[PDB]
Amino acid sequence: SDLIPAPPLSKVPLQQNFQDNQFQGKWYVVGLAGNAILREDKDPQKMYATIYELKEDKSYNVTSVLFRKKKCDYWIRTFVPGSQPGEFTLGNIKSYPGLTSYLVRVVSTNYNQHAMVFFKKVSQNREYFKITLYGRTKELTSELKENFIRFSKSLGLPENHIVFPVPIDQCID
Ligand SMILES: O=C(NCCN(CCNC(=O)c1cccc(O)c1O)CCNC(=O)c1cccc(=O)n1O)c1cccc(O)c1O
Ligand SMILES: [Cl-]
Ligand SMILES: [Fe+3]
Ligand code: NA
Ligand code: NA
């Protein structure tokens, strides 16, 4: 396993004043980048969606829905608030074999249109990270998408580690 290193959190911006309620709801993953993410033009990534529903006690209840093998699989987990508004950590961490650490950080969002969230995961002792271009709709402006490509590069990811999942209608509507 050769892997680009996770950047210093120092160079991963936080969205200052973070409104945890205005971020609730469905988000379409219009952009996906990471040191373990790789463009594959034979079988391009199908677009998927993540639903953030706020508990209860303010931890998010994060359900991801994605269309795989002619069905909808539901990846479900909890984000517990961390250091500061916009930062979270994975809840019930012991459920996941090999998993030592998981860190969520909301880089930027205007809540009703778009969002960039940074994730950093240490699993089986290897250190992964990814960035997510969240769209409230399935398509986004070139401005936002290129701005995301720039940020993804600012953290050492080359263009072939940056994908834009192709929109689908299965499971995600
Ligand atoms: O279940 C999923 N498949 C993960 C397959 N995978 C790709 C590489 N990951 C990555 O590149 C990656 C990098 C940073 C953060 C992530 O969540 C990542 O999946 C690695 C599998 N990951 C796990 O075992 C895992 C166990 C427990 C929580 C968790 O989130 N993950 O992923 C999955 C689906 C939708 C969104 C996710 O975020 C997922 O994780
Ligand atoms: Cl993924
Ligand atoms: Fe994950
Ligand atoms: Na390590
Ligand atoms: Na749904």
Side-chain angles (χ1 to χ4, degrees), residues 1-2 4-15 18-37 43-52 54-67 71-75 77-79 81-93 95-112 114-119 121-123 125-138 140-145 147-158 160-173:
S1 221
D2 303 16
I4 290 154
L9 270 42
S10 91
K11 68 166 82 307
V12 181
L14 182 67
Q15 169 78 16
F18 176 85
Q19 290 311 318
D20 71 333
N21 56 328
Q22 290 193 59
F23 195 80
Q24 279 179 100
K26 205 215 291 159
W27 289 99
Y28 294 100
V29 182
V30 323
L32 215 202
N35 60 2
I37 299 299
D43 192 64
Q45 178 80 232
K46 279 167 181 166
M47 178 174 272
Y48 68 99
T50 295
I51 288 84
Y52 289 72
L54 227 173
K55 306 263 258 226
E56 330 287 57
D57 57 331
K58 304 315 196 160
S59 292
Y60 276 120
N61 212 338
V62 189
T63 301
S64 269
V65 59
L66 41 220
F67 181 44
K71 287 186 168 206
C72 316
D73 305 23
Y74 296 93
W75 183 234
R77 72 284 188 198
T78 296
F79 289 165
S83 193
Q84 45 199 334
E87 271 198 41
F88 315 88
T89 175
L90 187 69
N92 209 216
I93 216 274
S95 317
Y96 309 88
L99 203 80
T100 298
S101 169
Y102 194 95
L103 159 67
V104 187
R105 170 112 92 186
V106 182
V107 179
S108 66
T109 184
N110 73 323
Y111 301 96
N112 57 43
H114 54 260
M116 279 206 314
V117 181
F118 176 94
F119 310 78
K121 168 235 275 169
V122 170
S123 169
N125 255 134
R126 307 178 295 248
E127 180 151 50
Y128 301 92
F129 74 106
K130 79 183 179 187
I131 323 184
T132 287
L133 215 207
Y134 278 150
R136 218 93 230 203
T137 58
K138 299 182 179 182
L140 270 161
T141 76
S142 277
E143 191 168 350
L144 273 158
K145 297 204 298 196
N147 167 67
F148 160 74
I149 301 199
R150 254 136 54 188
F151 182 61
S152 291
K153 276 171 184 168
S154 85
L155 309 193
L157 298 174
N160 79 302
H161 277 254
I162 305 179
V163 326
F164 291 88
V166 73
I168 66 164
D169 302 329
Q170 290 90 338
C171 313
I172 64 178
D173 296 81

